[PDB]
């Protein structure tokens, strides 16, 4: 199993920024995709962004392209979501997640059917 724990979060004025971090169990192998998902109360969970833990290829949900940036630091077992240009629509509980992936040619990370989940962190965007 891979364990994950979010840090960062809180309240930010619209237009502002916030970074989320996700700490990853230290002996996690390279054969994974890391991702961020979010869920607002009343709504279904939705994919936000993902990064291949081995190759660094990224993918984003359309509504955050150009605003959020996902990155990783394998040496520190960390994943990050830099949230810029925050909009009221972005208010949600954000979850770190990981998915085991076999070796392959295409490095493009998955956006669904993740295996391992953090406990979530609330991000609230005001005005």
Numbering used by the authors: 1 to 52, 52A, 53 to 82, 82A, 82B, 82C, 83 to 100, 100A, ...
Paper excerpt:
Three heavy chain only camelid specific antibody domains D7, A12 and C8, termed VHH, have been isolated after immunization with gp120. These antibodies compete with CD4 and b12 for gp120 interaction and exert neutralizing activity against primary isolates of subtypes B and C. Here we describe the crystal structure of the camelid VHH D7 and determine the molecular determinants for HIV-1 Env gp120 interaction. D7 folds into a typical immunoglobulin domain closely resembling known llama VHH structures.
The crystal structure of the llama heavy chain antibody fragment VHH D7 was solved by molecular replacement and refined to a resolution of 1.5 Å with an R factor of 16.6% and an Rfree of 19.4%. It contains two canonical (CDR1 and CDR2) and a long CDR3 typical for llama VHHs with a non-canonical CDR conformation. The base of CDR3 is well defined and stabilized by multiple main chain and side chain interactions including hydrogen bonds and salt bridges with CDR1 (Ser31-Arg97, Asp33-Lys95, Asp33-Arg97 and Asp33-Ser100F) and CDR2 (Ser52-Asp100C and Thr56-Asp100C). The extensive inter CDR stabilization suggests a potentially lower flexibility of the CDRs upon binding to gp120. However, the tip of the D7 CDR3 (Arg100 - Ser100B) is highly mobile evidenced by the lack of continuous main chain density for three residues, including Tyr100A positioned at the apex of CDR3, indicating that their conformational flexibility might be important for gp120 recognition. The CDR2 of D7 contains Trp52A, which is however not solvent accessible. Instead D7 Trp52A is involved in CDR1 stabilization as observed in another VHH structure. CDR3 of D7 is tilted 40° towards CDR2 compared to the orientation of the CDR H2/H3 of the other antibodies, whereas the apex of CDR3 is also built by an aromatic residue (Tyr100A) like in b12 (Trp100), F105 (Phe100A and Tyr100B), b13 (Tyr100C) and m18 (Phe99). The decrease in affinity is mainly due to an increase of the dissociation rate of the D7 mutants, which suggests a change of interaction between the CDR3 loop and gp120 but no major change of loop conformation. Together, these data implicate that VHH D7 interacts via CDR3 with gp120 and identify Lys95, Trp96 and Leu99 as key residues for this interaction. The structural and mutational data presented here show that D7 does not expose an aromatic residue at its CDR2 and that Tyr100A at the apex of CDR3 does not play a key role in gp120 interaction and HIV-1 IIIB neutralization.
